[PDB]
Design an enzyme around this catalytic site. Structure first.
Site, PDB file in Angstrom:
ATOM      1  N   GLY A   1      -1.580  -4.576   7.230  1.00  0.00           N
ATOM      2  CA  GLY A   1      -0.428  -5.683   6.252  1.00  0.00           C
ATOM      3  C   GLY A   1       0.350  -5.409   7.266  1.00  0.00           C
ATOM      4  O   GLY A   1       0.819  -4.899   7.863  1.00  0.00           O
ATOM      5  N   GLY A   2       0.950  -7.304   6.635  1.00  0.00           N
ATOM      6  CA  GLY A   2       2.021  -7.266   7.916  1.00  0.00           C
ATOM      7  C   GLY A   2       3.116  -6.583   7.882  1.00  0.00           C
ATOM      8  O   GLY A   2       4.163  -6.062   9.325  1.00  0.00           O
TER       9      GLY A   2
ATOM     10  N   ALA B   1       0.903  -0.838   0.211  1.00  0.00           N
ATOM     11  CA  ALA B   1      -0.052  -0.156   0.165  1.00  0.00           C
ATOM     12  C   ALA B   1       0.905   1.126   0.178  1.00  0.00           C
ATOM     13  O   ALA B   1       0.443   2.399  -0.087  1.00  0.00           O
ATOM     14  CB  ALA B   1      -0.741  -0.027   1.467  1.00  0.00           C
TER      15      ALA B   1
ATOM     16  N   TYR C   1      -7.514  -0.570  -6.559  1.00  0.00           N
ATOM     17  CA  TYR C   1      -6.197   0.479  -5.981  1.00  0.00           C
ATOM     18  C   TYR C   1      -5.304   0.933  -6.840  1.00  0.00           C
ATOM     19  O   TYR C   1      -5.125   2.977  -6.241  1.00  0.00           O
ATOM     20  CB  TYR C   1      -4.857  -1.083  -5.596  1.00  0.00           C
TER      21      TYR C   1
ATOM     22  N   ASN D   1      -5.553   5.121  -5.328  1.00  0.00           N
ATOM     23  CA  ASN D   1      -4.834   5.757  -5.114  1.00  0.00           C
ATOM     24  C   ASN D   1      -4.364   7.355  -5.925  1.00  0.00           C
ATOM     25  O   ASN D   1      -3.849   7.611  -5.426  1.00  0.00           O
ATOM     26  CB  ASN D   1      -3.526   5.044  -5.717  1.00  0.00           C
TER      27      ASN D   1
ATOM     28  N   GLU E   1       3.159  25.209  10.368  1.00  0.00           N
ATOM     29  CA  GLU E   1       2.353  25.677  10.908  1.00  0.00           C
ATOM     30  C   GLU E   1       0.561  25.751  11.066  1.00  0.00           C
ATOM     31  O   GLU E   1       0.163  26.099  11.963  1.00  0.00           O
ATOM     32  CB  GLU E   1       2.383  27.824  10.182  1.00  0.00           C
TER      33      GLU E   1
ATOM     34  N   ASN F   1      -9.706   3.525   3.503  1.00  0.00           N
ATOM     35  CA  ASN F   1     -10.554   2.747   2.268  1.00  0.00           C
ATOM     36  C   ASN F   1     -11.736   2.990   1.864  1.00  0.00           C
ATOM     37  O   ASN F   1     -12.499   3.143   0.391  1.00  0.00           O
ATOM     38  CB  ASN F   1      -9.495   1.173   1.771  1.00  0.00           C
TER      39      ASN F   1
HETATM   40  N1  LIG Z   1      -5.476   2.533  -0.736  1.00  0.00           N
HETATM   41  C1  LIG Z   1      -4.613   1.315  -1.083  1.00  0.00           C
HETATM   42  N2  LIG Z   1      -4.663   0.469   0.244  1.00  0.00           N
HETATM   43  C2  LIG Z   1      -3.963  -0.618   0.157  1.00  0.00           C
HETATM   44  C3  LIG Z   1      -3.399  -0.628  -1.605  1.00  0.00           C
HETATM   45  N3  LIG Z   1      -2.485  -2.090  -1.639  1.00  0.00           N
HETATM   46  C4  LIG Z   1      -3.035  -2.826  -0.135  1.00  0.00           C
HETATM   47  N4  LIG Z   1      -3.612  -1.760   0.854  1.00  0.00           N
HETATM   48  C5  LIG Z   1      -4.622  -2.052   1.794  1.00  0.00           C
HETATM   49  O1  LIG Z   1      -3.292  -2.981   2.934  1.00  0.00           O
HETATM   50  C6  LIG Z   1      -4.184  -3.995   3.172  1.00  0.00           C
HETATM   51  C7  LIG Z   1      -3.046  -5.165   3.127  1.00  0.00           C
HETATM   52  O2  LIG Z   1      -1.736  -4.471   3.688  1.00  0.00           O
HETATM   53  P1  LIG Z   1      -0.835  -4.239   2.339  1.00  0.00           P
HETATM   54  O3  LIG Z   1       0.376  -3.191   2.012  1.00  0.00           O
HETATM   55  O4  LIG Z   1      -0.836  -5.098   0.871  1.00  0.00           O
HETATM   56  O5  LIG Z   1       0.440  -5.796   2.727  1.00  0.00           O
HETATM   57  P2  LIG Z   1       1.838  -5.268   2.898  1.00  0.00           P
HETATM   58  O6  LIG Z   1       1.914  -3.573   3.811  1.00  0.00           O
HETATM   59  O7  LIG Z   1       2.952  -5.303   1.651  1.00  0.00           O
HETATM   60  O8  LIG Z   1       2.709  -6.268   3.822  1.00  0.00           O
HETATM   61  P3  LIG Z   1       2.682  -8.242   3.809  1.00  0.00           P
HETATM   62  O9  LIG Z   1       2.326  -8.163   2.602  1.00  0.00           O
HETATM   63  O10 LIG Z   1       1.595  -8.761   5.132  1.00  0.00           O
HETATM   64  O11 LIG Z   1       3.922  -8.766   4.134  1.00  0.00           O
HETATM   65  C8  LIG Z   1      -5.216  -3.810   3.069  1.00  0.00           C
HETATM   66  O12 LIG Z   1      -6.333  -3.174   3.983  1.00  0.00           O
HETATM   67  C9  LIG Z   1      -5.231  -3.429   1.476  1.00  0.00           C
HETATM   68  O13 LIG Z   1      -6.770  -2.957   1.512  1.00  0.00           O
HETATM   69  C10 LIG Z   1      -3.428   0.291  -2.385  1.00  0.00           C
HETATM   70  O14 LIG Z   1      -2.537  -0.175  -3.428  1.00  0.00           O
HETATM   71  N5  LIG Z   1      -4.132   1.658  -1.992  1.00  0.00           N
END
Ligand SMILES: Nc1nc2c(ncn2[C@@H]2O[C@H](COP(=O)(O)OP(=O)(O)OP(=O)(O)O)[C@@H](O)[C@H]2O)c(=O)[nH]1
Ligand SMILES: Nc1nc2c(ncn2[C@@H]2O[C@H](COP(=O)(O)OP(=O)(O)O)[C@@H](O)[C@H]2O)c(=O)[nH]1
Ligand SMILES: [Ca+2]
Ligand SMILES: [Mg+2]
Ligand SMILES: [Mg+2]
EC number: 3.6.5.-
Lengths: 426, 69, 440
Positions: free
Chosen positions: C143-144, C12, C224, C228, C254, C206
């Site tokens: 995400g992790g 993300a 996405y 984005n 500010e 989101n």
């Molecule tokens: N707005 C937006 N949200 C995203 C995008 N990609 C993933 N997400 C959100 O991020 C969350 C999942 O986290 P990710 O960023 O995909 O996973 P990560 O940070 O790569 O961590 P891991 O893959 O588990 O190692 C979910 O809630 C998705 O909806 C994106 O391109 N845009």
């Protein structure tokens, strides 16, 4: 890359394992000679998950064939894709197991387990980043059940941080008549609870019913049953083999599907299931949640869903898929546990399976799976109370204590499923 | 007043350094504790697998004893 | 001077970073190879866009950015994408195995193997700054990597850079595009761990962005890419003060002075207008009053919550385009007498206004219409605590049964970390209640 090492043990494991490789090779455009003759770059984007690339642009499956008799594996080598497998990856014995779990697990499989581990070690060393292992076998025999569970523990010892996945075939009196299959299944289930991260319950009882009741096959053969297995196995691995966001690897699948470590036995489902002699998204969605489409002989409305993974394949409206998935959850809210919010995850793959415009694959972790284990337990206790055929097992060194422990652990597994079925948010 | 001005800026320096010190110490404690916990979980998993191997050796040895008779 | 370093963590964070930096290049006239013909000073300079771009001798304008992910596939698209020449290869850091939606793996098991390399690369960017102002960290909550590794990085950044400013753009999970059931766990864990290391965090729900794309842009199933593109416009509005110069331009710091009354109350609510399609914008010019009025429509907020049921502690208006103060003042006066704008009794009710004359830009082939004027409102409202409440309720339902906790314990975490994180969230919700109570 994120490689998966495939292992097939026993007659059933090699049979369904061979059909699995035939189906996915066709989907990825791989011929029996290992060359690529496809027309979509999506076929090769994640090809290294299941295939090794060799000289001459050859794609060799990362598969290891194991059996205690050469019979099944010889026919696999003579099959349509028998020449695509690596010849050194064939590891077979001669004595066999005689449908005895002890021989596979303690006596005969133990003599051959080290030779298998050498092939496993060779394939794992050449992995850029190993995900884990997937095993195809049956629980009612001797080699796939006995040596298959032995291989899991030995591999778990050298790769404790990797995901262990199994495609386990549940015995049923409607398919095979070996009366000690409840013994072999219970002993194997005792091992699967402790040493596997996720297990697909392929129930021959459900496969026979689908072929007979739904597919209108009066005399279902193993080929008819395996056709359901190949379609199911292709669907559940679609997220692994094609680009996607949801459950793209074994560990992420396990994290989304396994709320408690012991409850990792899944109920597969596939749609459409039509026999020889236009389908909509709402019909496809409704059908995949029906008990008649489950590959495990369990009614999901006799239990509650802990987690569900849904996979749609083909060209369709993603807006419609989202609406129908929400619709089925709202209309069946009582059958989903409230203390796990948003427990249903949906994936869409553009490439459909062979011969289908659209398809749906269902992966469910339902407390109703206790019905499958209750059927095995009831058949187990019907013979163990009479101590039938026990000398065939105790003659290999086992004792009645191990049978009792296996029975108790599976009975505990049923109790744990009932516990979380009765659990409430308040 | 000059003395107070010195004390204020020294107080800001001390609190900033103490924040850095606390952050470094807390993280090191967490990373060490996590490392021990994960290794302990893996050690317990391997020990159970070794106990299975010991049981298998006992089973195979039990078969040789009865085969002699 | 006043350089800002952007850190994009996880899928993300990285993919949102792609949209932002593409938009930045379009706004500043920077080509995909980094060349900027309008920049007559070769190899360096102190222009406003230099806060986000460094300059090489060959005339390349390089983002002051680091992309970090524990899996290579997302950043590999950057390495082979349209803007691959924009970044030096050392700015794109990848592992081989991701965190598998597990905070523990991102923070401990996998993250510890790459954290030193990331800090070294960040240090390289910092050493090129004469006046480093702070960091912008883009990550998801669910995400992790976005949760676990970000919190680990934030803790390390506090150690290596003291109290230098760290701002977040955080992606709040929504079921429509979520990928893990444990996202409420990762969200609470990373919010607790990062709370004392973050000076200001802009949460992006989101679902709010998903609804805006469906409702205002007629997108049936937003991707996405759809989300984005919209997110980058809000980010661009927030950072436009740092990247552009103007007489009416007001620096983001500010605004930050008014937005953060207490260190833990540092989560502003963002509202952006106009979000309109090309078909609807044709022959329909939206005035200052219309876009200002849309800022108080809850359907245009980046976080789903109801400010009409809460109290305001700050209200900032960030205009860009053809906007003059006279129209702003008249529009604000109309809104003050027609909207539910209740301030806490310990805060002034005046609205803080900034104007950047550079008109908004749109990525070609996008869905947003190019408008002559746009506004982003940054408000500190107690209603944003509703986002915590929804997340904490999901946490409580699963944690009462200890569902999925074994995946975290198996990676070395303890149940105490879960309860400690949840208690911090409960205190945070209590803090937002306390600041809304009238004084005695
Ligand atoms: N707005 C937006 N949200 C995203 C995008 N990609 C993933 N997400 C959100 O991020 C969350 C999942 O986290 P990710 O960023 O995909 O996973 P990560 O940070 O790569 O961590 P891991 O893959 O588990 O190692 C979910 O809630 C998705 O909806 C994106 O391109 N845009
Ligand atoms: N679905 C399916 N089940 C099979 C097949 N072959 C055997 N089985 C089942 O597996 C059980 C016997 O296991 P088997 O594979 O013969 O034991 P092994 O060769 O010693 O591992 C019986 O319950 C059969 O119903 C097959 O090709 N397809
Ligand atoms: Ca310059
Ligand atoms: Mg057989
Ligand atoms: Mg990722």
């Amino acid at each position: 890359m994120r490689e998966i090492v495939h292992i097939q043990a026993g007659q059933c494991g090699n049979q369904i394992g061979a059909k699995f490789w035939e189906v996915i090779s066709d989907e990825h455009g791989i011929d029996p000679t290992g060359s690529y003759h496809g027309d979509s770059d999506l076929q090769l984007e994640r090809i290294n998950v299941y295939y090794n690339e060799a000289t001459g642009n050859k794609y060799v499956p990362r598969a290891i064939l194991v059996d205690l008799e050469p019979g099944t594996m010889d026919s696999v080598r003579s099959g349509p894709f028998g020449q695509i497998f690596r010849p050194d990856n064939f590891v077979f014995g001669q004595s066999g197991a005689g449908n005895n779990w002890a021989k596979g697990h303690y006596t005969e499989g133990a003599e051959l387990v080290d030779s298998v581990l050498d092939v496993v070690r060779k394939e794992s060393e050449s992995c850029d980043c190993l995900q884990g292992f997937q095993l195809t076998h049956s629980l009612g025999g001797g080699t796939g059940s006995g040596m298959g569970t032995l291989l899991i523990s030995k591999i778990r010892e050298e790769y404790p941080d990797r995901i262990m996945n199994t495609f386990s075939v549940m015995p049923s009196p409607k398919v095979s008549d070996t009366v000690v299959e409840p013994y072999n299944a219970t002993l194997s289930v005792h091992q699967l609870v402790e040493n596997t991260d996720e297990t697909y319950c392929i129930d021959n009882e459900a496969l026979y019913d689908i072929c007979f009741r739904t597919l209108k096959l009066t005399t279902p053969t193993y080929g008819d049953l395996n056709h359901l297995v190949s379609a199911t196995m292709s669907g559940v691995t679609t997220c692994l083999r094609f680009p996607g966001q949801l459950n793209a690897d074994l560990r992420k699948l396990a994290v989304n599907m396994v709320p408690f470590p012991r409850l990792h036995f899944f109920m597969p489902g596939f749609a459409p299931l039509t026999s020889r002699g236009a389908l909509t998204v709402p019909e496809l969605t409704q059908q995949m949640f029906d008990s008649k489409n489950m590959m495990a002989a369990c009614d999901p409305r006799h239990g509650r869903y802990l987690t569900v993974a849904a996979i749609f394949r083909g060209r369709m409206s993603m807006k419609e898929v989202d609406e129908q998935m929400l619709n089925v959850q709202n209309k069946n809210s009582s059958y989903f546990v409230e203390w796990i919010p948003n427990n249903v995850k949906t994936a869409v793959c553009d490439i459909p399976p062979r011969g289908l415009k659209m398809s749906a694959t269902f992966i469910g972790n339902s407390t109703a799976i206790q019905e499958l284990f209750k059927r095995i337990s009831e058949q187990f206790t019907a013979m163990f109370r009479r101590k039938a055929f026990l000398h065939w097992y105790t003659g290999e060194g086992m004792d009645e204590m191990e049978f009792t422990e296996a029975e108790s652990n599976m009975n505990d597994l049923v109790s744990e499923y009932q516990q979380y079925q009765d659990a409430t948010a308040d | 007043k000059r003395e107070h001005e010195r004390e204020v800026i020294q107080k800001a320096i001390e609190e900033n350094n103490n924040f850095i010190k606390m952050a470094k110490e807390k993280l090191a404690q967490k990373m060490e504790s996590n490392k021990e916990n994960r290794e302990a979980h893996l050690a317990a998993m391997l020990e159970r697998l070794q106990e299975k191997d010991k049981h298998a050796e006992e089973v195979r040895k039990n078969k040789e004893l009865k085969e002699e008779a | 001077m006043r350089e800002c370093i952007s850190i994009h963590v996880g899928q993300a964070g990285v993919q949102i970073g792609n949209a932002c930096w593409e938009l930045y290049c379009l706004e500043h006239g920077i080509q995909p190879d980094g060349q900027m013909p309008s920049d007559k000073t070769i190899g360096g300079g102190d222009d406003s866009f230099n806060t986000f771009f460094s300059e090489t001798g060959a005339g390349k304008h390089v983002p002051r950015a680091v992309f970090v992910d524990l899996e290579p596939t997302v950043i590999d698209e950057v390495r082979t994408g349209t803007y691959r020449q924009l970044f030096h290869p050392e700015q794109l850091i990848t592992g081989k195995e991701d965190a598998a939606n597990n905070y523990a793996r991102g923070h401990y098991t996998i993250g510890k193997e790459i954290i030193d390399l990331v800090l070294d690369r960040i240090r390289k960017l910092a050493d090129q700054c004469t006046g480093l102002q702070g960091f912008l960290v883009f990550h998801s909550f669910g995400g992790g990597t976005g949760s676990g590794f970000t919190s680990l990085l934030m803790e390390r950044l506090s150690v290596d850079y003291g109290k230098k400013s760290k701002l977040e753009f955080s992606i709040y999970p929504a079921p429509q595009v979520s990928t893990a059931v444990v996202e409420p766990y990762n969200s609470i864990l990373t919010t607790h761990t990062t709370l004392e290391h973050s000076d200001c965090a802009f949460m992006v729900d989101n679902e709010a962005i998903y609804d805006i794309c469906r409702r205002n842009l007629d997108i049936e199933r937003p991707t996405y890419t759809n989300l984005n593109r919209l997110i980058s416009q809000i980010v661009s509005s927030i950072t436009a003060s740092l990247r552009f110069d103007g007489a009416l331009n007001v620096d983001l710091t500010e605004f930050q002075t008014n937005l953060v009354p207490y260190p833990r109350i540092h989560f502003p609510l963002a509202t952006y207008a106009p979000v309109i399609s090309a078909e609807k914008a044709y022959h329909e010019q939206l005035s200052v009053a219309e876009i200002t009025n849309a800022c108080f429509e809850p359907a245009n907020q980046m976080v789903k919550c109801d400010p009409r049921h809460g109290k305001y502690m700050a209200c900032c208006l960030l205009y860009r385009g053809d906007v003059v103060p006279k129209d702003v003042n008249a529009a604000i006066a109309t809104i003050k007498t027609k909207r539910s704008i209740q301030f806490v009794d310990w805060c002034p009710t005046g609205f803080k206004v900034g104007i950047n004359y550079q008109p908004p830009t749109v990525v070609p082939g996008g869905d947003l219409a190019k408008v002559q004027r746009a506004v982003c409102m940054l408000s500190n409202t107690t209603a944003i605590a509703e986002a915590w409440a929804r997340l904490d309720h999901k946490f409580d339902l699963m944690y009462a049964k200890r569902a999925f906790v074994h995946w975290y314990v198996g990676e070395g975490m303890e149940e105490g970390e879960f309860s400690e994180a949840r208690e911090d969230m409960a205190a945070l919700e209590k803090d937002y209640e306390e600041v809304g109570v009238d004084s005695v």
